[PDB]
Design an enzyme around this catalytic site. Structure first.
Site, short mmCIF file in Angstrom:
data_model
loop_
_atom_site.label_atom_id
_atom_site.label_comp_id
_atom_site.label_asym_id
_atom_site.label_seq_id
_atom_site.Cartn_x
_atom_site.Cartn_y
_atom_site.Cartn_z
N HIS A 156 -7.56 2.96 -11.38
CA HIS A 156 -8.40 4.41 -11.78
C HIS A 156 -8.48 5.27 -12.05
O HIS A 156 -8.36 5.40 -13.17
CB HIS A 156 -9.36 3.58 -10.79
CG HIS A 156 -10.02 2.34 -10.73
ND1 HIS A 156 -9.65 0.90 -10.23
CD2 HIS A 156 -11.38 1.54 -11.61
CE1 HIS A 156 -10.42 -0.26 -10.21
NE2 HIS A 156 -11.55 0.63 -11.14
N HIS A 184 9.45 0.11 0.03
CA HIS A 184 8.44 -1.07 0.63
C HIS A 184 9.45 -2.64 0.41
O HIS A 184 9.47 -3.41 1.30
CB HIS A 184 7.43 -1.36 0.22
CG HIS A 184 6.61 -0.50 0.63
ND1 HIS A 184 5.93 -0.23 1.76
CD2 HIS A 184 5.45 0.64 -0.49
CE1 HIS A 184 4.89 1.14 1.71
NE2 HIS A 184 5.50 1.23 0.60
N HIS A 208 2.45 -4.48 -1.90
CA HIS A 208 1.25 -3.15 -1.32
C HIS A 208 0.38 -3.35 -0.36
O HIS A 208 0.73 -2.75 0.58
CB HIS A 208 1.63 -1.78 -2.99
CG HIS A 208 1.72 -0.67 -1.89
ND1 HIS A 208 1.47 -0.42 -0.33
CD2 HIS A 208 2.63 0.57 -2.26
CE1 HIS A 208 1.59 1.07 -0.76
NE2 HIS A 208 2.42 1.40 -1.75
N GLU A 226 0.17 -2.71 3.98
CA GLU A 226 -1.29 -1.87 3.73
C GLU A 226 -2.72 -2.35 3.99
O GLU A 226 -3.45 -2.50 3.84
CB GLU A 226 -1.02 -0.61 3.29
CG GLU A 226 -0.14 0.46 3.65
CD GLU A 226 0.25 0.88 2.29
OE1 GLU A 226 -0.29 1.82 1.73
OE2 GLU A 226 1.72 1.46 1.62
#
Ligand code: HEM
Ligand code: HEM
Ligand SMILES: [O-][O-]
Ligand SMILES: [O-][O-]
Ligand SMILES: [O-][O-]
Ligand SMILES: [O-][O-]
Ligand SMILES: [Cl-]
Ligand SMILES: [Cl-]
Ligand SMILES: [Cl-]
Ligand SMILES: [Cl-]
Ligand SMILES: [Co+2]
Ligand SMILES: [Co+2]
Ligand SMILES: [Co+2]
Ligand SMILES: [Co+2]
Ligand code: NA
Ligand code: NA
Ligand code: NA
Ligand code: NA
Lengths: 263, 263, 263, 263
Positions: free
Chosen positions: A90, A210, A148, A178
């Site tokens: 976004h 990650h 993620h 998350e």
């Protein structure tokens, strides 16, 4: 005066072993559009900071597009290598819209959808993921794809994707660092299946920090460490989805749509 | 996390003899705001191009503000050294608005008015111009101030200014290279006054190429050449208005207002 | 699906004796564009409030354009009958831009320049004003044109216009209720000319409350009252500039340019 | 000068039997915010058209907000009763942003999330749906929730929701008229379960024309008609989700967040 350019935008990586998956995407784009200039930008501030620290130019999308306006580009197709249309995607859309139509600048700036765009993309991603599995994975052995996760509403893409994967194979699972589903949700899925060998694959474009630390790290709270404590043979696979041709093809189609939206 | 910066924006010059007037403005700003970082940008593409050609960094306002977002600035006061709120000043306003509120970027970007902002500025400019006149100019000797001129509606600032100047001295005249009043209008003003010695002063911040070539050039169509052909002793003065303390003080006040608009 | 409309926007009037000048403008527009629908809006809140109080629909530009989107218009040319590009004209530009490109709404919304747009308009206005003078005004008798005045930078249009008028007639003067030149400035102009009979004409589209009260009122602080106290025969003329064909023609040209900007 | 308002926005219905669910939402809002004015708007053009045809005011979000600016509101919280953040919800966000900060208009316009906002909303929706089931539905009897479906990327909310529902009950199914999962997907789910009695419930706020015609119509291609042809006892339930207190509570929380975002 017309001049068309392509801006590839990755979350990014600062670790040498992970940057090859970006370069592989750069080749694919060059191969499919041999006469269009291709530039790079990165959405993560901390990663632009580490890359500058190592002496590598790493522009934010704003710096990149201001530089491209300066080189005389008029029509730019921006393609993110994000997986979902969350906060970063976004922000990238806001940034592109801000540049288009500024005085003496870019006439048109279009943005390609991230990986999981439509429900038709989501089904195509599920198929591509299946095609990307390691040849040594056996039927029946679960595979956990690690996304993620985000507090943004686009987090709903992970459970959406899980729907599509299950239509193909009841043992393909989605987990996130998350968001939802959580790793605890994944372990409860593994317990009902009594799985002895489990594969872990990053859902992100590059196998970054990650992947190396949260999914496959040596420390106790890593996914593989947690699976080993419950007697599961964890098989982590450190390849981002950008290494798969079948997955990359979906980003490429999105880039084609964004080029066509320039006229 | 708050961090305040100042962006000074000039049309710009690429000629060594003219850049000192920019540096003098930089000092004035530093002297008045000793603890605020000050950065530069330039609105003219051709001038950014010549400065890069000579190996000097010369960012557009977009590049500058993207770079400033990257250094962690949150609140930036942009001050143009334009004379009127024409096309370039409007473009600068669009560019500032575009950067403010972008994700992880600048929170607030304010823009200071150009020289001739309100009717109260216009009257203050007229007074400052008078104070800037060379000591050797004699009472009764006309002075022609040369402005750029533009097809933009803000061109009306030149005849507006002429109004204010005349309230002070019937022999102070405004002319422009590309708008109204024209140089022909100025010569018709000179003929009715039967003036034998005429002073020419740039109205722009720096005595740039229009000042050196169109106003004071050796070629036939320059202002001084045209005045010499009609038997007038032309006295061109190659100092931009940024060299005058009384004129610069008006840009400084505008910068103060723009800093206050940040809160 | 294409459908073109015209939005005429006046500051407005709520007094019956003044509304005829609006209706005269409506005819002119209809006569010049016989097949384009024409709608009205008003920029002044207090006037929309009085018109609603009398049972007359009086939409703001926002209400008008939302209603027009609702009727299926796709391309709208907005023409203000403002005199200068001040605060109200700028607000109208922001409002038009806000509507264009909204989902399922207007595709294109263009805005015509107010009366004093370019320096070429300003010179054409000066000529039109001269052509509009009453036949009984004698050569040598000063005429004071009354403009609104504003703290906005576009106030500079009044002294700009004074420049153009003087090029035609040294006795044509510009004054404003709230800006520069002030009425005191005008009286000082009148004293040096020792004028015995002075004409007063509104510069605004309609002879509204400023014309009837501030310019020509019975109270002591009106322009005509102040001139009578200094022994001047004041001749106020209560016709807005929209009554003049020569002035209206300039608004019409602006509307033509705005229609052409729709493609 | 401060004044706070609430704009409730429904896709809408034009059928008398369906409007009660809107009125029930209006009460809930009034009951929770007794001193804040509440206004209505509708995103569907065809429905504004039918409501105007019956003599009922039915403003678009643009008309509503222009009218509210006109009544002196300064801070407006817009709450859609959409289910997903698709095309209509995005258009509503563009429309709200366009109104905020317009001259003399609304200072702040906030927008509340649709039903399925975060993954935490999605899980809360799944629970609320379960709580909303008819008391006569027996354990083991599948329930098909009918959503609209869209080509927009937010379509991924339907398979996302299916994930959450299954975590609660393997026999709760999601289907859509125009997206994914399709009704064919739902019938294939029903065949493997060999279900003899199936419940159908609209997922939308009001049981509108899709509920009465596509889900429960008499014609051959309706969901209940198709289920009857394969020997399934179809039990359609014509209540929109706005009738459930447990579902409505999620829209209310979203409205609270949007009010708090006004400051
Ligand atoms: C003498 C003529 C003009 C003058 C003196 C002028 C001056 C200015 C100034 C000083 C501002 C600062 C914004 C503020 O006050 O909040 C401004 C804003 C702005 N101006 Fe101009 N302008 C003129 C003509 C125009 C024209 C012709 C356009 C469009 C074609 C325009 C478009 C805008 C826009 C879009 C903004 C920002 C938002 C707004 O509309 O207020 N101006 N202008
Ligand atoms: C599942 C997919 C999507 C979801 C869930 C979603 C959801 C949302 C939500 C919840 C917001 C609220 C703004 C905020 O958080 O501050 C938002 C803002 C916005 N969205 Fe979407 N969207 C999706 C896809 C898209 C697409 C495809 C576009 C463009 C084609 C888009 C364009 C925008 C824009 C322009 C805004 C306002 C400013 C911004 O970019 O943040 N979204 N979106
Ligand atoms: O997220 O680190
Ligand atoms: O203008 O050169
Ligand atoms: O201005 O009344
Ligand atoms: O969709 O009707
Ligand atoms: Cl084995
Ligand atoms: Cl001498
Ligand atoms: Cl007489
Ligand atoms: Cl039974
Ligand atoms: Co992270
Ligand atoms: Co020039
Ligand atoms: Co007034
Ligand atoms: Co439908
Ligand atoms: Na991911
Ligand atoms: Na100038
Ligand atoms: Na006026
Ligand atoms: Na729905």
């Amino acid at each position: 005066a017309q001049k068309t350019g392509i801006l590839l935008v990755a979350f990014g990586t600062s670790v040498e072993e992970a940057r090859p998956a970006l370069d592989k995407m750069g080749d694919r784009v060059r191969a499919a559009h041999p006469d269009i200039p291709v530039r790079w930008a990165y959405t993560a501030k901390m990663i632009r900071a580490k890359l500058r620290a190592e002496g590598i130019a790493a522009p934010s999308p704003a710096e990149a597009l201001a530089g491209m306006a300066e080189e005389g580009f008029t029509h730019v197709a921006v393609q993110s290598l994000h997986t979902i249309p969350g906060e970063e995607f976004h922000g990238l859309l806001e940034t592109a819209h801000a540049f288009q139509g500024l005085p003496k600048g870019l006439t048109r700036v279009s943005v390609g959808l991230p990986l999981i765009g439509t429900t038709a993309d989501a089904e195509a991603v599920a198929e591509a993921l299946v095609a990307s599995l390691p040849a040594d994975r056996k039927p029946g052995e679960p595979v956990v794809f690690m996304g993620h996760g985000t507090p943004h509403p686009a987090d709903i893409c992970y459970p959406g994707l899980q729907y599509y994967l299950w239509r193909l194979d009841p043992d393909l699972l989605v987990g996130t660092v998350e968001g939802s589903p959580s790793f605890d949700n994944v372990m409860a899925e593994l317990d009902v299946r009594k799985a002895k060998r489990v594969w872990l694959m990053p859902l992100m474009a590059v196998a970054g920090d990650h992947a190396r630390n949260d999914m496959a790290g040596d420390e106790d709270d890593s996914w593989t460490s947690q699976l080993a404590r419950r007697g599961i043979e964890a098989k982590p696979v450190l390849h981002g989805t950008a290494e798969s041709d079948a997955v990359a093809a979906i980003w490429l189609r999105h880039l084609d749509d964004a080029l066509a939206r320039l006229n």
